[PDB]
Amino acid sequence: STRRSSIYRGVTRHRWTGRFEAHLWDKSSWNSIQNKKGKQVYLGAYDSEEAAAHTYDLAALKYWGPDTILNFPAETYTKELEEMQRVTKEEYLASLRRQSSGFSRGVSKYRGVARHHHNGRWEARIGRVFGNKYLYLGTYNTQEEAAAAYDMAAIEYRGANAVTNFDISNYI
DNA sequence: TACTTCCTCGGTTTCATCGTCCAC
DNA sequence: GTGGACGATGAAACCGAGGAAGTA
Ligand SMILES: [N+]
């Protein structure tokens, strides 16, 4: 019936946002709500379709090695292939998500950071469906400080697989 | 067939932002 | 008055259930 939303593997143009989502099918992990093997992994949103394709390629390389099926040949990812080896799978996926277009929108380049009225300072906020709160994390003089606060709250309320503005290792 | 792998996009959650409260 | 602390709102991200697309 319908033509595929993207010419690339693992890329779906979202019907409402118009963003190119990268996603991945983990055929080895176990879906526990179902019985069967298989889990959908969301890699992020990208304003550029080619960027979502590259994101899929890199995540697939981290999951299945240099001859899994790729939108582009593994020779184009040689450098990334080495860097990939130095981190967890979760660390690498968090990094891929951190570079994505949808990670942070608006004025600040950091997620959870926006500006306190017109005071020239930066508020950090974080969302928590438990308690139905948009928690306030303070006002800071630099975006990096606000982003640090957002990060700390993020690791606290999301633990592992928490995507932070700055590297998870900064907070050990 | 039946069965696995992959895509889609609607609920759900969270952010970006701006404007409002109240304890000082 | 007022200014941190937040709440309201709309935009936009997140993400799996489910159906579509390949297998074999
Ligand atoms: N967007």
Side-chain angles (χ1 to χ4, degrees), chain A residues 2 17 20-24 40 49 60 78 88-89 99 107 113 120 124 129 149 163 168:
Chain A
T2 185
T17 64
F20 299 107
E21 292 176 343
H23 52 79
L24 165 149
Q40 259 274 110
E49 184 175 28
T78 51
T88 339
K89 163 165 90 214
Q99 300 188 34
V107 172
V113 178
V129 62
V163 190
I168 317 100

Side-chain angles (χ1 to χ4, degrees), chain A residues 22-40:
Chain A
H23 52 79
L24 165 149
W25 183 247
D26 181 8
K27 91 149 90 63
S28 278
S29 160
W30 170 258
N31 213 328
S32 230
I33 279 290
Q34 287 52 14
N35 315 357
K36 253 281 193 167
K37 254 174 191 214
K39 288 204 56 34
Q40 259 274 110

Side-chain angles (χ1 to χ4, degrees), chain A residues 5-117 120-146:
Chain A
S5 73
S6 172
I7 68 188
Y8 294 122
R9 171 188 185 92
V11 175
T12 283
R13 180 187 183 281
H14 189 279
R15 180 255 180 283
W16 293 109
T17 64
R19 271 34 187 140
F20 299 107
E21 292 176 343
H23 52 79
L24 165 149
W25 183 247
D26 181 8
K27 91 149 90 63
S28 278
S29 160
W30 170 258
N31 213 328
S32 230
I33 279 290
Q34 287 52 14
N35 315 357
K36 253 281 193 167
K37 254 174 191 214
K39 288 204 56 34
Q40 259 274 110
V41 179
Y42 169 64
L43 308 172
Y46 299 80
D47 300 335
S48 149
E49 184 175 28
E50 190 203 314
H54 286 313
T55 288
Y56 173 85
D57 279 359
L58 292 162
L61 287 189
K62 177 69 182 203
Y63 267 73
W64 303 304
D67 43 69
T68 199
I69 297 136
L70 304 170
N71 295 306
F72 301 96
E75 312 75 85
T76 76
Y77 302 107
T78 51
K79 281 189 253 152
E80 295 88 332
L81 275 169
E82 321 189 41
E83 170 67 10
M84 211 179 302
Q85 324 205 152
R86 312 195 37 130
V87 286
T88 339
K89 163 165 90 214
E90 286 66 14
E91 242 177 292
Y92 196 65
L93 261 43
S95 65
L96 283 178
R97 186 87 82 79
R98 178 175 6 259
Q99 300 188 34
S100 69
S101 281
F103 178 67
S104 96
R105 300 296 195 178
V107 172
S108 165
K109 55 174 110 54
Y110 302 117
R111 194 202 264 259
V113 178
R115 63 206 332 178
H116 179 154
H117 318 156
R121 283 165 90 227
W122 305 96
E123 273 175 51
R125 303 297 286 283
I126 189 160
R128 199 152 163 252
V129 62
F130 177 88
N132 190 26
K133 297 267 164 19
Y134 197 39
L135 302 163
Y136 163 88
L137 300 178
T139 320
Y140 306 75
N141 289 76
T142 68
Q143 314 182 27
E144 285 69 26
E145 290 168 273

